Amino acid sequence: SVSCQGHEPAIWQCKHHEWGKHYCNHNEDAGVTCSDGSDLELRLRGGGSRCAGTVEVEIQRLLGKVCDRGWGLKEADVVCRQLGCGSALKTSYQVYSKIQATNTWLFLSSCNGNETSLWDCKNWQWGGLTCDHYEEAKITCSAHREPRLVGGDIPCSGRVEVKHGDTWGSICDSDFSLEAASVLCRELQCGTVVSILGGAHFGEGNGQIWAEEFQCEGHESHLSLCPVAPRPEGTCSHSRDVGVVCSRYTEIRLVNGKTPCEGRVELKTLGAWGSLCNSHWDIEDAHVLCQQLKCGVALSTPGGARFGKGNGQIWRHMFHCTGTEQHMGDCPVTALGASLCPSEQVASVICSGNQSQTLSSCNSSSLGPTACIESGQLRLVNGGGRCAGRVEIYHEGSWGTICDDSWDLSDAHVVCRQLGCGEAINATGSAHFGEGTGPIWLDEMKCNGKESRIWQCHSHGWGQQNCRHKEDAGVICSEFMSLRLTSEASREACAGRLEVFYNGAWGTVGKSSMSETTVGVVCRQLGCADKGKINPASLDKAMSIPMWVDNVQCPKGPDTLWQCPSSPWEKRLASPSEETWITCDNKIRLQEGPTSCSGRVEIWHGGSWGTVCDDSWDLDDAQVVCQQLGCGPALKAFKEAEFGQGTGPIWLNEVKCKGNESSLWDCPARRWGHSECGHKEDAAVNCTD
Amino acid sequence: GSNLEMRLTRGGNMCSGRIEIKFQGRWGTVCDDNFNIDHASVICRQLECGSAVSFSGSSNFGEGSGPIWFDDLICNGNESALWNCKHQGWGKHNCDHAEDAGVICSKGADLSLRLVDGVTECSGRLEVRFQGEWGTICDDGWDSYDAAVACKQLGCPTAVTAIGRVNASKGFGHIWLDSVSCQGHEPAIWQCKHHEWGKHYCNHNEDAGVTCSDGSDLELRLRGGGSRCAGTVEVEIQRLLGKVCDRGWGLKEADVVCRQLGCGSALKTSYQVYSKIQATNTWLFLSSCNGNETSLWDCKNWQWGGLTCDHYEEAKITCSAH
Amino acid sequence: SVSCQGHEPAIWQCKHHEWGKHYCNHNEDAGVTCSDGSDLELRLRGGGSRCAGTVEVEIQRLLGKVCDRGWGLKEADVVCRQLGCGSALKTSYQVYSKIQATNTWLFLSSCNGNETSLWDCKNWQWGGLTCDHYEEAKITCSAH
Ligand SMILES: *[C@@H]1O[C@H](CO)[C@@H](O)[C@H](O)[C@H]1NC(C)=O
Ligand SMILES: *[C@@H]1O[C@H](CO)[C@@H](O)[C@H](O)[C@H]1NC(C)=O
Ligand SMILES: *[C@@H]1O[C@H](CO)[C@@H](O)[C@H](O)[C@H]1NC(C)=O
Ligand SMILES: *[C@@H]1O[C@H](CO)[C@@H](O)[C@H](O)[C@H]1NC(C)=O
Ligand SMILES: *[C@@H]1O[C@H](CO)[C@@H](O)[C@H](O)[C@H]1NC(C)=O
Ligand SMILES: [Ca+2]
Ligand SMILES: [Ca+2]
Ligand SMILES: [Ca+2]
Ligand SMILES: [Ca+2]
Ligand SMILES: [Ca+2]
Ligand SMILES: [Ca+2]
Ligand SMILES: [Ca+2]
Ligand SMILES: [Ca+2]
């Protein structure tokens, strides 16, 4: 029990007990290890790289390990920081080799987590103790498998590349999957995954092609936390590089501001820098912009042009933000047919700059006629758009519906105007948009139509109702749009006239300024295919409906037509030579074959191409595939990847076609799921020319 | 040059371990990249130990990087020494991780094949001892030719060799071998061409297996019908009963069964149910028959167990002599 | 490893392992709770009546809950009978309101089912551990 302050000349000068009498045992004997600090080294061994494995220490040319008695993520962070491998993620790893056994151990008391090196942690013991009920300490830092995207114009699209040590290599499209894509867009903070594009869509890489597959479940926050399955080498070439498109494609910056936190809002689309205008720009949108830019919360949005107006370009996008979103790419945005706005009106925002503030809801709903988000939240569910669906309200930490009784247009007007959806066209009841789950918060609502919020209406009370779930209220608002392709044969098809449903009315789209990006967006939005072409006008036109919108220009990144800039809405009677007719490409494809009717079966669904597993594959199934492409009767139904390996996910599994189905979609099978089938089992067919 | 000497370290044996070369009086550990099976053969031939069965990257540590005298070498595999072939660098290297390239020569390697989880000795799963760990074999690429080599090596009757495991539920461990390609005359399984050790495209569910048998242990009969010429197909091999799954069941293969039973040609694939039949777990899978074979045992690549068919059902047949 | 029969005059008198420094890798520190039998109270909250909800235990004015390690209809029968609400039917309840959060927990070994009160079951532990893979104990008695 020697007690030394740290400046005594010798040990016996210190406080201690009587010489010769102690309760100690010879097992607990004291020693020291004095060092220049030259000989101390740290390593990770057995994990697949230098940033994963078992922590190995070598102090004065003696090898040891660290006992995990008090090992946590705070202590692991210091080691990963010391090695330069980023922050620690988990206290385990996936083994790749075997590491030799040593007898010596290193013991740690505790670390604050901000130390630069492990040797700076207080009271670490080298040897003198054995730990047998515990194991060694293992880490997996965040630089184990660092991903990146390259080769894309928009911020969150490009070629997938992962760093192995200090080199970057490409990935073949047979190894990537939809679950691994979710962990890659999420890790890079790019939101959800929109599409997977193989075959060197963004160009080819040079230097390395990693031969491994990530077995990701889909919820991991890093690619390092995901198991990796080694695969045979040389199975792919650089023409098979994989690429991804995530959902955060928006570019917003603040310019002409004295400080970086405040300035004039600017947006980049179609390759030009322009400024938004003040209409439909609110504090909720400004809160999200400041949070994304990491400035904090927005004090106010100056009117007029406080920071001036630069450049001739004006962008008329409208963002409908709740205020809780972290990125402007999460906010619903519509730019189709947006009205012109004067050059004087330009959006601005002045953020606090503290970066420490975090905002949340304040006070309560306060039912009754009359830096925090509103307590009551409104949303529309299951309507096919943001401006149609079943009305729901957030109260006491739950989402609840509104009773059909005494629900009319006057009650609907305040619902549509509060959400930024314009006026109300319909007020539907009796579960038109489906049955709801949860409490019925309101009943017998009576509104004059001039109110601001729904809780300002006269109602019986919060949760006081005699209703059932089959009578749930819904609205259809004025600013609600749907899209379809109309032909003579069918109202909805993959070829026909393009019609836009706006203000409760249908109408056509002008053909001028149509591009391949614009035609592709329509085909992907409707679910037909990935690309398309505009054919001349057909022989018959139905009802000669008036033209709604024109000059539609679609950038790269949107998957719906509502986000494409255009000219303002204008209902005009127009000749059939101006209306747009579009034919989409085939949803099924045969690839890697000597003849067009023989090859590997691919189907397009959910934004990306995919293959079909060969279990339950027969000739009757092959009959449908040859029928859909227009080929002749099938010769044989190949199995086990005869023609090659497939790209993308695996959509259809356990296919049982009756033999007379028009398309593979009508056949009963496991549809749009995550089966166990691998790409080695994709099916192929051969058809007569 | 002849001044260089190559030694193997950290493997526990002379013939297996990490490659070390002495240049200018210092040891060096060659980096793994550009390591072809030709160089593994040459290195095992330089030491005169034998052929090379594995070329593992071993501990690939950037820390403590040592200069490499023979890096990014290219060779045809016919030369007796590494320096004989064309060289890229001398004394240095441009390598990303991949340190301590190690080889495992055949003579120093200890490899064995055993059968386990079977009704008899010559039946069940196949396991391979690779460096002391027992590992399974992936069934992808398993045919009757690969079974014949395995039966000879295991010392079993080779009159009739059938793929598949009769009752082994699953295997635990590594999958050492995948896509074994034997011509049927090789002495051992590993002597044939296959994927690199450890690399596999499959799970532990599809483990390989053989059923070596001379004959008279497998009998075919029809049950549950009006007579012996109509009813469900029931097969019993080594006194283990089973039924045939109808994944590829047609009038061509059913004709072989009826002809084998002496019941004439095949009329229908169903029958009238007179009595019930007890259920059996194990299923017999056959790919396809030409209708010329005298018995089912003459059809190629018939697999006895190892897969399940939940969506399909048992095979049935009604012959003409009903 | 203190082993006593309940009649010894002190802890060191009854058979214990030895006097020495112990690591106790798997176990924790020992403690007791001595009571006259009046401070302990049991009640059910959040269920829409006194006979349904989440079992809330208050001992010496400390509010806590009961872990469901050994919770079953046989153990819940003691609680319903002790409260006087009949017999236990279901180990759940229909929610009517929200309940407070308490750090303390109660752990039960087993109850024969015929005990008059929960304070008569053998070897019940008041605090000292935590429940991470388990939840609170909820019952619905018959007289609900
Ligand atoms: C780490 O944090 C502790 C606790 O706040 C503080 O005393 C110490 O100075 C910090 N060290 C460094 C290097 O910032
Ligand atoms: C909405 O109201 C319009 C105008 O009366 C009517 O034609 C249409 O059928 C209504 N739709 C629904 C879904 O109620
Ligand atoms: C399969 O059954 C046989 C007897 O028919 C038995 O010896 C063997 O152990 C069984 N296998 C398994 C994996 O249970
Ligand atoms: C059956 O036909 C095949 C294919 O022509 C032929 O090779 C074989 O010899 C025939 N078998 C008999 C028993 O005639
Ligand atoms: C409860 O039942 C058990 C088991 O039969 C019995 O030993 C015990 O004495 C009973 N308790 C009372 C208080 O009757
Ligand atoms: Ca807004
Ligand atoms: Ca009603
Ligand atoms: Ca009303
Ligand atoms: Ca009512
Ligand atoms: Ca089928
Ligand atoms: Ca297989
Ligand atoms: Ca083979
Ligand atoms: Ca005791």
Numbering used by the authors:
A (entry chain B): 332 to 701, 712 to 1030
B (entry chain C): 154 to 475
C (entry chain A): 332 to 475
Extract from the study:
Given that the CD163 trimer was the most prominent species with the most distinguishable features in the dataset, we performed 3D refinement on the trimer, which resulted in a cryo-EM map at a resolution of 3.0 Å. The structural model built from this data shows that each individual subunit of the CD163 trimer adopts a ladle-like shape with a dimension of 80 Å × 65 Å × 175 Å. The first four SRCR domains (D1–D4) extend away from the membrane, forming a handle, while the last five SRCR domains (D5–D9) near the membrane surface create a compact, bowl-like structure (S2A). However, the disposition of the subunits in the trimer, designated as CD163-I, CD163-II, and CD163-III, is not symmetrical; instead, they intertwine into a structure resembling a tilted cylinder. The trimer is held together by four direct interdomain contacts involving domains D3, D7 and D9. Chains CD163-I and -II pair through D3–D3 and D7–D9 interactions, CD163-II and -III interact through D3–D9 contacts and finally, CD163-III and -I contact each other through D7–D9. All contacts involve electrostatic pairing interactions coordinated by a total of eight Ca+2 ions, which are clearly visible in the electron density maps. As elaborated further below, this configuration is not compatible with the CD163-HpHb complex formation or ligand binding and therefore represents an autoinhibitory state. Comparative analysis of the CD163 trimers in the unliganded and Hp(1–1)Hb-bound structures clearly demonstrates that in the absence of ligand, the upper ligand binding arms of CD163 swing into the vacant ligand space, engaging in autoinhibitory interactions, thus creating both direct and steric obstruction of the ligand binding site. However, upon addition of EDTA, the average mass dropped to 140 kDa, corresponding to a CD163 monomer.
